[PDB]
Design a protein around this ligand. Sequence first.
Ligand code: NDP
Ligand code: NDP
Lengths: 367, 367
Amino acid sequence: MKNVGFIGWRGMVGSVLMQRMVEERDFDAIRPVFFSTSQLGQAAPSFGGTTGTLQDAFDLEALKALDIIVTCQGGDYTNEIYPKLRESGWQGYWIDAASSLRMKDDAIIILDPVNQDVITDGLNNGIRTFVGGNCTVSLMLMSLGGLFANDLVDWVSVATYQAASGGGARHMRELLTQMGHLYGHVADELATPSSAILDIERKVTTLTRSGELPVDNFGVPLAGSLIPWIDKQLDNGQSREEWKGQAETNKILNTSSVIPVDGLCVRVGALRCHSQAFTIKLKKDVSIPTVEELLAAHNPWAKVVPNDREITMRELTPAAVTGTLTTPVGRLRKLNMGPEFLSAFTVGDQLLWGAAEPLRRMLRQLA
Amino acid sequence: MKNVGFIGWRGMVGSVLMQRMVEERDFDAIRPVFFSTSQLGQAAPSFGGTTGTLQDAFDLEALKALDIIVTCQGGDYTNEIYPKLRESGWQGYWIDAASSLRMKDDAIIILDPVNQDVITDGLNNGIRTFVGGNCTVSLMLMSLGGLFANDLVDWVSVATYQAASGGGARHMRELLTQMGHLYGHVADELATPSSAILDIERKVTTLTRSGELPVDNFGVPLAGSLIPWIDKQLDNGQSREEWKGQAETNKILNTSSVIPVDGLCVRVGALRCHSQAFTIKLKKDVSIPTVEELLAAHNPWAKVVPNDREITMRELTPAAVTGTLTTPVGRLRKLNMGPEFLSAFTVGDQLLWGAAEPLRRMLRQLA
Ligand SMILES: NC(=O)C1=CN([C@@H]2O[C@H](COP(=O)(O)OP(=O)(O)OC[C@H]3O[C@@H](n4cnc5c(N)ncnc54)[C@H](OP(=O)(O)O)[C@@H]3O)[C@@H](O)[C@H]2O)C=CC1
Ligand SMILES: NC(=O)C1=CN([C@@H]2O[C@H](COP(=O)(O)OP(=O)(O)OC[C@H]3O[C@@H](n4cnc5c(N)ncnc54)[C@H](OP(=O)(O)O)[C@@H]3O)[C@@H](O)[C@H]2O)C=CC1
């Protein structure tokens, strides 16, 4: 029985991760310890049928006692404790969800179904830090894994439809709240099916334009609009969120040569799943049936959806994926630009495969 | 004082078109009329000093009396009355917003700022039908007009973030309603900002997945998700909404050679504005400053937004455009694939430039 510490288990990711471990009875093989950063000393989760109290997430000594650490707290926490802990001589395993140590030397980005070999290699090479990549990239590779795995990709152009859950709980709750505010302001006009549309329109356009909407976690309203910028601003024209695309994809895949990945990461009113619209350029003119066969033959979760108007609406949508381990790919076909241009549209819960699952699976490897 | 008849002025478009005509004092140079297909007999608009009662938009004899007809009703009406009317020998002008006659020989797709010449030529050639193009395309050309106007485009790849207002009033009201249902179900949990996020999450995911959400106008929930298919299914892998991209763009621009336009049209929780993420391939390596200078030098509404994280959030969003005649373009820069790949992201009210305005401006031309 290994002493596994859990930090940031209360957050959006931690919660999904906890819920998942119970399902697969993940707590049966380990010795759970629950840390906190604001409720230190309080009653502990007891997920693994364990009775205790919340440990000091910042107690170095307390942290050095565990064989493994699983954090879903955030990058701010990592950058604060990790360097200080490794310095203390801690030679345990650090499984993280935050981006912090992703592009670091002593860390390996994990996506079992996509790069187990890399994982294993680094494992036999001394790597003790395993980090999950960006939920979107992690999702992209899970859905379009077959293509890369066959060296069929020349470069990729993405346009993401990212859900509010990506920013965390406060962000989701904010969207939902903003949602309510919007509706309420016109609940009566909506009650009267004939009432002029402009009346309802003006009313909602005004609310939004009025600082009345809670935008503390988004800076701007998202309920009835979108935001073309996710992460910080980089020294280039790229936004950190977009830049993660190319960097991490090559790291995860351990490519011999950079596979150009770029596009636009946009935040939308999507509640829980992350969807992406691709414009991939193939090295050779591969037939779509071959492509589909490949994508499906890469991993049990990569599910190809037919280019059907009905099916697409019923399956290639957050509402039909949110909560599932499936990572659908649809709207697959060649673009008018030529047969080397493949058009695809994926969707997937970024809290599972894009977050919790990779870690959960990795933890079981070291348990 | 021409006899201009107005049909379908009640809907999401007619309303906008009407509200605009008042603002610009458009009614002053014309003797209006107001028909209807669902409230014949009731009260008339009372816009341009002409109050009375809705007339029969199905009375051919009555229609033949007008010098011009402006419909915002819909394709079903057009397909029904237009052929029958032109047969009766009606030689008047027909300004439409409906797709029906767009790709027809006797019609011209209007976008004054983008193709005045074509409009004019067609006017001098005998064309009496002027139709506005798909909101999306119409918006793209208004925003990216400078590029095409300079033969700098090789082909375009779009991924649209289309608003609920595109489907009409019932569609918007539905989204808004769906919105309220979502929030309400978790109004209490949201009231307690410290409560567990999964509880709230589970609660909203259940509602959606349950047929309790009003999805009459969309077939599936949109409030907290999206739909990767807009129009009907074409005999190819393209969805009618996407297919409109290439066809109309070349018609409007009156291109000598087809400019490949393709991508994915998705419907989102956006309330009123249509945003688009492009991946355009230039014929030559044009510097971004040149591009920006061009885009801005094409038309007074094409506004280039700097690649600033702050500015972008504050301006390149539906909330900051909805209700304005401006068609912003931001996130402009070269993609990693090479200097010939320009990345752009536009936003614009599809009910103004995407709908009413083109007609409004055209009518005045014929007044
Ligand atoms: N959100 C997503 O979809 C994904 C996020 N990530 C990454 O994972 C890390 C954590 O992400 P995420 O789960 O979104 O973070 P959250 O902000 O939702 O959770 C992190 C911490 O926030 C605190 N918190 C404060 N208020 C609440 C509240 N009302 N409900 C729940 N928790 C609250 C908790 O601190 P305390 O210790 O006191 O309990 C918790 O551990 C980040 O580095 C992020 O970038 C990676 C993939 C996906
Ligand atoms: N929506 C958009 O942003 C754009 C739409 N178009 C095109 O314009 C055409 C019409 O679309 P649009 O105006 O959006 O459609 P709407 O359904 O919003 O309005 C058009 C007609 O719908 C009827 N209607 C039924 N119920 C309502 C209601 N509750 N509130 C208001 N009107 C109602 C009205 O008929 P009646 O008067 O008889 O009651 C009205 O004339 C289409 O062919 C479309 O493709 C083009 C560009 C943009």
